[model samples]
Target chain A: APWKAPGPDDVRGPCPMLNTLANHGFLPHDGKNIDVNTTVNALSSALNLDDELSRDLHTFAVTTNPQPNATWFSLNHLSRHNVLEHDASLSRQDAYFGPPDVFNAAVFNETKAYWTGDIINFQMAANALTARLMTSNLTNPEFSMSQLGRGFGLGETVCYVTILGSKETRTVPKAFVEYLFENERLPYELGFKKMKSALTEDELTTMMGEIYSLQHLPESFT
Target chain B: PWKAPGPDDVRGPCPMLNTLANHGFLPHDGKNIDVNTTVNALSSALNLDDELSRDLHTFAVTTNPQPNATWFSLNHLSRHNVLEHDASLSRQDAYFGPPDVFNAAVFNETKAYWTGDIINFQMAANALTARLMTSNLTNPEFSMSQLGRGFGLGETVCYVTILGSKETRTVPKAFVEYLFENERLPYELGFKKMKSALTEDELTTMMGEIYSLQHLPESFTKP
Candidate 1:
């Protein structure tokens, strides 16, 4: 029911997520660039909507690219060179506690779009997979449990979503953060495994099935 | 031969490409966000030094992405947005031009990544394709021809090379600019057709044969 929530009739106020959601997207602010803190507040308000709506909005938020000095993506690490510069020390290798960086070297290719050199296709694929897999069963606890085992594999490249409530901004929900830490959690893992296991079977047959499945199945839900 | 051309240590500015070539690896620079640009420049520069380089670098200079005050890809603006703004018009059409805009539909989509958001891929592919097609041409004139063509398509992306050398820093090449207005020049007309085509079958097949062809053909030489 919730959609494109409006925010703020004033230049600065508490995070507008709560007011906008309650008032039904009716903040009607005059300004465009809200302070980062206010931006986080807006996000929290958006999340305070119904669970289904909040979750869907969050998913959209996670996958949608943030604009300049606007909406924060959990994983967007404000400074581009910060991670790449300190990547060695900051890499998720320590396992227990390192910044969540998911820069996959295997796919380091970049594009020069509106947002300079983005990770492009992988982030989308990864985001969809994470969202679908986290729909149920894995709340923050289970998510965190998996992270303990999986290592913070997302590293620095992958951004996590955070919510700003009151004066505090929360990073990716502990549970969803867990989901992003592991790739085995992908929604398509089973079928993907089947394709891989079929290596012994005729490669063509397995490949054909994948192509055929694509014709009928929805396009890359995750 | 063409090892990493050190940014002019004394009087010369070092070109990141020259130094990164040969070894096929590059360290990230804080100022430079286009990883592919750095990588390709390295590849082409080495090729040039070894007499194996392609002239495609010139073409990239024409269509390369622009940076804001800082040089992050995040700062890029579509030609539509820039030109429209230049004419003092509101950025009313920014969304259709770049997906990650700050407008209604754009802000919502801006918070994350998704499938079919091939905007970046298309840009990179176009850039890579340009290098592939024009790199090995025997003459720099071929590269010029391609630039003229890109201009006709009204591609507003700017490359680093094109900015200072020519006085028309704000716009594209004169030939391209002229073709854009006339819409009758051969390079402009042919450029339009070429822009519509993706990498040819032969090129794609060749790309497939090489493992890291997307990065650079390990040993591709000018034909």
Candidate 2:
């Protein structure tokens, strides 16, 4: 089973990549106390992220661990408000509105629904992100997103699009984007796989810069 | 003769209190200042009268940390729970962001809700209700203990009573904006200070009228 649904008691967090990796057994199926070693290896095996980049994400994620001075972190630790997670998520309702860690079909579709055309490029991906933020901003009275939180959102968008699409074109098929976000399953049959050259933070940030124009709008609506 | 607060003088969350302190009615430093001194300032300036103003300040210190302490600092009241709750009219909640600072964006959202030129008791209370409902849906660990709830409503009522008129239960829109946005009294606008004492009964009647209008929505904190 390349992609198994999260069994009862198998922790799955807000990140689709984390969920997909665990589902594919790149990370532990249990998803508990994931150390740097486990996280680095998972990103490497599944998304082919560079060791340094993978370690950096792990560093950020582990800081949210509830336990004092712990090197490892549980998936559930990321669920806390203002602890790294911010409101106005692309797929999930704000932690204030509903479960922060679980997939919300209605909310997720708001962004996905914007991918109405045949293909979603870097511009279209960023546009889709804007669509979701506007929907939440209008719909939720308490929609809150700081600059750092907005950066994290864009980073996530780049990961899934490139992780499931391609860095060369910076474009992904509508089906590939849908499958990755919806099923939390890496689309192997659709020819998605780890890149030949490992992806780096530098590469993602460059793509993110292209997507940066829209990120500014969602935070302040200024 | 009243003096302006110096550039370095510490201010507080409540604009009315800040205005009084700024105008030399209360301690300008806003530090570990005595409330007994400012109780009369609050009375004369805010129209609460000595009895009602003193009663309100005593009630204000219900959440004061120091035991058997007579006077409280303005910043002490800035602590979360009563004086600075989430879903504030002008400030962000400590749970979501900086609690004490004035968030103009947040203020813009709430102020737009007042449909009329004059701020009436029912609509003012409804705006507070809207804030709490939005806050309940926004803060992850949102809690609404009944004591906390009363303080939230009473805080709004005090502003409405003092800034506007106690008898009319209303204030002009500009007076409210000046009080909220600038944290300044509307002395320039010919809005006069309270010569009449704000009695306990008047507060109850206004606060009770406000309570009836609080169609507070159920919280989304499905915890």
Candidate 3:
């Protein structure tokens, strides 16, 4: 990697991909005062996301910035939950229960406990997210989410499946899942690439819908 | 079952994995990294795929002079512009002189075409087109056949892909010059290996994008 771990000065959030991008100079190295246009560029360049898809993500992500303008934000701004970050994240503790920003290995173990075989297919990925949500709701008295927040949980699974894995098979290497959540660096030596086919917004939404269809939401939320 | 090359230093063209071998990332003497090793090295160094390299390796062996050759050497690639060609990025034309040797005179011109110390997407595409146009108009017998253009452009893609950061889409001008000028990977200048396989179709799309960025015509035109 050209860059190193996020230094002490850098602030991070619940999204490992964003932090990894920031660490690698895909986003601002300082993790501060980033604009929407650059966010689109960073996301597209680092993850092979189409501009339309990247823009929608940045548009929402910018709201977390308490800066006077809506067009720019810092990486730390992403910790304001329910904007994009949410409870029941695949590798994070809910804000009601803990810090909710950094990767918590114990809680992450809860997510990994859900995995079965070597390749994580769509159903397995969906089940992990669903189980995490169920655990969060039961564990936290204040646990709650909006509709978009619901898909954000599914969207996190979609990220690993599609980027670290592939769209056609709907499966990622079982090791790659552990690699990203643990290291927060792209698993380049393990053969993960950003030069793969860029993903369309519709395709991401399609994956989410498929994951949604496969998931059995907690009885109360449904 | 064929043996390796003798005292002579085996050499070839701008083929993707062959370049990695030349740079000592694979078997530097141009023998037996094996098809699988070559495939993985290409994946490691330039992000090209295994099956893509496998497809290419099978085709490459067809040029071997040895009987029942299943893999080939770098020397086999010197088949007078079949896989190699005129208007090379850093080599001489076959008609005038030895085409295999690194020709500093040629790449200096390509370097001159690059406007800034840092190379961006537009300028690299612009410089590549400019190099093609210069060769088209200047060299008396310059011939970039469709066969050469097809793979040649992909070779160019592989060069840029290896030496730059995908995050910034920018590489230092010195790092690129280091690749063609030294025929070496730019590891010393902070170029690190990427994490993923670079697919043929992915490179094809990138080449198409590079082609569309040309401000100059590929050859002399009336318009």
Candidate 4:
């Protein structure tokens, strides 16, 4: 395989994507001014990771909300922002995260959990996708779950994935991660037409099945 | 008239281009950065050169082959990918250029454009530019040279660095006044009488006069 297959080690870290989430107050933080390094380290530790999960949580925030230095104070700034919001609400029917807390902590935690699930989901999916790409003799598999996660805030991403499941009541579509894997880039705004036409039914279905299995969807969903 | 119309006369281009060009941000040969140089900075930053670099360069040239093109291109890169990479995934510990150079150049640009005569769009544009520059100043990763490179089209050894940080995307009414009153009309138009204050209708008529006098095409002139 031309692809440099990421070992278990490649998939781990306090990633750029999550650090950005914390920077925007999406994840919790210490409310004090600090140096940039301090801020990065502080946020990295704050994602509430166990030592095991912490290994996989490796990434950091590089992009601001808008251009030059935009913030994620609003969903409008995120890719597939609307789709995630709709899916988050739809996932509410599963009662998985329970009702939201005063700060919507339940939803936030569930979403974060699901988003974390997706990081692993992509790692596993890449293994599969990478195999397929290699078998098909495609040399440039040039993408990974980590790179796709690099596209947006961690909290928001999880919120989208958390809501999308096999549950009967779930009305939301899947996260845009699929688009990232299929193409080396995230879906462009108003770029849905290409996506609907791009993936084979079997390819997409298999990917979603992997996602659902990794997420441990409820029996009713199964 | 054969010079492919000063950008002002070109139909369908952003009016901001002319305003910026008038203020020396879009100089024909100022110490500015160009598309290709900026692409290298991004390619260096991202470590993956295939699509992202090409898309950014294509966007820069198609938009305008000037320093101002860098500003628009950077925003698109940031929104879509580069900033995202810097935010989360870039393994590179430092930016491609020297920080002092980047900071100094940004300072110079901001000061040059700092007039009480600034407009709303310029205000927004300048504020964002200042914030990004300030972030770099404190953090000190890339050079002002890199930013300047991002913003221009020079070909020195540091030509690549010069293309990354050139700023300016909009022109204000004050710039238009500067063009007219100072007689830098960008084309073959003759001098005109200056008015201190005009009614909205008069201003509208005058704007059309300015627009018409530009080296525009028949298609632009008819509409």
Tens-digit lDDT track of model 3 for B99-150: 7667888877777767888776677776677767777777898887766666
Per-residue lDDT over B13-46 for candidate 2, one digit per residue giving the tens place of the 0 to 100 score? 7777777777777778766556677676776676
Show how many residue pairs clash in every candidate, following the order shown: 41, 0, 4, 50
Q: If chain B of candidate 2 is superposed on the true chain B, what is its TM-score? A: 0.88
Where is the poorest 10-residue window by lDDT in model 4 chain A? A93-102
Maximum-DockQ candidate: 3
List per-prediction Cα lDDT, in the order shown. Answer: 0.27, 0.71, 0.74, 0.29
Candidate 1 wrong stretches, greater than 4 Å = A1-44, A48-98, A101-222, B1-14, B17-129, B140-223
What's the CA RMSD for each of the models?
Answer: 21.3, 15.2, 17.2, 23.4
Tens digit of lDDT per residue, candidate 4, span A1-222?
A: 012222222221112233233333433322222234443343334322233222222212213233444221222222222212112221121112222111121222223333334333443333332232232223223322232332222233232232222112212233443433222122334232121222222433444544434332224321
The list of candidate 4 runs beyond 4 A from truth reads A1-20, A24-51, A55-172, A175-222, B1-17, B26-223
lDDT of 3 at A158: 91
Judged by DockQ cut-offs, the docking class of candidate 2 is incorrect
Off by over 4 Å in 3: A1-222, B1-7, B15-19, B22-24, B66-68, B216-223
Ranking by DockQ: 3, 2, 1, 4
Best by TM-score: 3
What is the Cα-based lDDT of residue B157 in candidate 2? Answer: 76
- Give the DockQ-based CAPRI class for model 1: incorrect
Model 2 chain A worst lDDT window (10 residues): A213-222
TM-score of chain A of each: 0.19, 0.92, 0.94, 0.22
lDDT of 1 by residue, A49-120 (tens): 233433433343333234543353332322132222122211121112222233221112211111122222
lDDT tens per residue, model 3, A1-222: 776788769877778888888888888888887887888898887788889988888887788888655788788899987777788887777887656787765576668867888888999888888898788888788888888788777777898889888997788888888888777788887987774778888899899999999888856684
Error of 3 at A137 (Å): 32
Each model's DockQ? Answer: 0.01, 0.02, 0.03, 0.01
